[PDB]
């Protein structure tokens, strides 16, 4: 309906998340996604897909 599975909503967003943020990257100037050797890039890809 929207009162229960609801806001007790975060709890079962802790079968879940405190590992902070990976492509979370959205704030600085030109370089911590254009320098040389990193875990999270094999994803944000194509002009297809």
């Amino acid at each position: 309906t929207l009162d229960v599975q609801m806001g007790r909503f975060m709890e079962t967003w802790a079968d879940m998340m405190p590992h902070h943020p990976h492509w979370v990257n959205e704030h600085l100037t030109i370089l911590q996604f254009i320098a040389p050797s990193n875990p999270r890039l094999r994803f944000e890809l194509n002009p297809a897909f």
Partner: protein, 49 residues
Amino acid sequence: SRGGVPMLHDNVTESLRRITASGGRLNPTEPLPIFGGLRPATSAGIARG
């Protein structure tokens, strides 16, 4: 290389060479054994500096 003393905070400065070593070619390791002369992995052969 070694010589220091133990242990009542770790895994977040574990967020500090897993979150430190910045701005150039190649960056380091996770699990921490002890006490050696330390020949390891593969790096690079020569074009500028």
